[PDB]
């Protein structure tokens, strides 16, 4: 643990500085160090962890998609053979992405999820688990794909079950979980109808609960509701 000698509070402070400097790899290393101190994470700290890894893996996913598109074009009929290089470099990016997902899943399993008892922590971590299995599924092939897909589904489902029992329909964690599980259904599980139904039901149940919210909470919830609507517009 390269961060073992740094104070927890200093790691959190440096994660916030790294965010301001758009140094997301550093931010993720600092937050991994903070998690490895063994204490539970506050709400702000959980979001620093997720922001950091989401940006790291997001860049990897964007690069993988560029390389996979080039690879597929090089394998079509009529294209010139340019050797193993595109595949090799796509594989390098893919292995680095899988390593990031393995790291995040390892933090969740040792030991964030098992110590998370409040809905706002447990749902957050189970959503993360679904998300990082989903990123693995995006690059997986064959039977490995099936088991990865089911692990994503299982984590999202447990998060959904808790969120419906313990959170209001406008809670931003609940909304973002539903948004992402809906995308899982559409893009990963080949279940577009389930994706559309989930997005619509989530949006409509949140709409009906907005009246209970302050102006700041209303802003947070309607922002994610607009993403649900955006996806519904893309899909219908």
């Amino acid at each position: 643990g390269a961060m073992g000698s740094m104070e927890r509070a200093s790691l959190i402070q440096k994660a916030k500085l790294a965010e301001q400097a758009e140094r997301y790899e550093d931010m993720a290393a600092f937050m991994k160090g903070a998690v490895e101190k063994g204490e539970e994470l506050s709400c702000e700290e959980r979001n620093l962890l997720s922001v950091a890894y989401k940006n790291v893996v997001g860049g990897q996913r964007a690069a993988w998609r560029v390389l996979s598109s080039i690879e597929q074009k090089s394998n079509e009929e009529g294209s010139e053979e340019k050797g193993p290089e595109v595949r090799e470099y796509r594989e390098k990016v893919e292995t680095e992405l899988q390593g990031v997902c393995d790291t995040v899943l390892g933090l969740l399993d040792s030991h964030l999820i098992k110590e998370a008892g409040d809905a706002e922590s447990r749902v957050f971590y189970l959503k993360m688990k679904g998300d990082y299995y989903r990123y693995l599924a995006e690059v997986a092939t064959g039977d490995d794909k099936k088991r990865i897909i089911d692990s994503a589904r299982s984590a999202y489902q447990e998060a959904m079950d808790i969120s419906k029992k313990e959170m209001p329909p406008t809670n931003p964690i609940r909304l973002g979980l539903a948004l992402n599980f809906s995308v899982f259904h559409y893009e990963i599980a080949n279940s577009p109808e389930e994706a559309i139904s989930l997005a619509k039901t989530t949006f409509d149940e949140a709409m009906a609960d907005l009246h209970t919210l302050s102006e700041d909470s209303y802003k947070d919830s309607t922002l994610i509701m607009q993403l649900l609507r955006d996806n519904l517009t893309l899909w219908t």
Binding site: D131, L179, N180, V183, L227, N231
Partner: peptide, 5 residues
Amino acid sequence: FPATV
């Protein structure tokens, strides 16, 4: 691509 958070 669709929106996720």
